[PDB]
Amino acid sequence: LTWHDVLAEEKQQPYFLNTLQTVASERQSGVTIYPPQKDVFNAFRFTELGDVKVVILGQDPYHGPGQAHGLAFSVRPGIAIPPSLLNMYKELENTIPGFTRPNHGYLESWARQGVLLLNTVLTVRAGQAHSHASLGWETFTDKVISLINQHREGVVFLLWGSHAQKKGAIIDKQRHHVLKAPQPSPLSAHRGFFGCNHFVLANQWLEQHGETPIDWMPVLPAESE
């Protein structure tokens, strides 16, 4: 069972197709949209439905050049680590044995391990946070989370902030493991994100069920000859 298996019908709904035409229109209208269209669904690309082990919801993609590449909280190599990801790294440094501050903010390696880095809104106009929040994306990501709840077993959900928490309220807390905390953004990180211990708790859960834990130290694609 793949994403395309469970979302094919959803992706033919007017609201959904319509969301994409509005983006494609905006891209040619004189404004820059992040991430590039080939990246918008990268969380799906890197983490197939059956490979989901951990779900980390973000809200809005980063809205600056070079930042957003289709994975919640991640930025491309060579880009400065944004404050929300820095705070994630801080919690990680304080809780995961051996963890040290990465020299990059690129989290593809998380995704390849089964961490679905899913923003609830998948596009944004450059420099304009939540600018596509009423496009239709939230309906789409509602359906995504619902499918995961239904079709998977024992996924760990890390729900950071009221929006993600609301979004994840439908999740079966008996079939899945839901962990709550404030967002890692600067405005709220020190209000409960620090000390939430979510990365360790995630791994303990996975280990309790015979799943291998996440290696949270993110790794840059290597150089070849």
Ligand X SMILES: O=c1cc[nH]c(=O)[nH]1
Q: Which residues are catalytic?
A: 60
Assess 39 for contact with ligand X (CB under 6 A). no
Stretch that binds ligand X, among 36-44, 54-62, 196-204, 206-214 (CB under 6 A): 54-62
Rank residues 49 and 107 by Cβ distance to ligand X and give the closer one: 107
Which residues contact residue 113 at a Cβ distance below 8 angstroms, ignoring those fewer than 6 apart? 53, 214, 215
Stretch that binds ligand X, among 42-50, 58-66, 199-207, 217-225 (CB under 6 A): 58-66
> Is-cis flag, bond preceding 182, omega within 30?
no
Please state whether 103 falls in left (phi above 0), alpha (psi between -120 and 50) or beta: alpha
CB of 142 closer than 8 Å to CB of 171: no
Q: How far is the CB of 145 from ligand X (least distance, A)?
A: 15
Assess 141 for contact with ligand X (CB under 6 A). no
Of the residues 119, 123, 141, 149, which one makes contact with ligand X according to CB under 6 A: 119
Of the residues 35, 61, 105, 182, which one makes contact with ligand X according to CB under 6 A: 61
Query: How many other CB atoms sit within 10 Å of the CB of residue 60?
Result: 22
